[PDB]
Amino acid sequence: CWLCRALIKRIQAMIPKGGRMLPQLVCRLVLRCS
Experimental method: NMR
Q: Would you call 13 helix, strand, or coil by DSSP?
A: helix
Q: How many domains does the chain have?
A: 1
Cα–Cα distance, 15 to 33 (Å, whole number)? 27
Q: How far apart are CA 30 and CA 9, in angstroms?
A: 16
The terminus-to-terminus CA distance of the chain in angstroms comes to 7
In terms of residue numbers, what domain contains 2? 1-34
Q: How far is CA 9 from the centre of its chain?
A: 6
Which residues 6+ apart lie within 8 Å of 34 measured at CB?
A: 1
In the chain, the amino acid numbered 15 is I
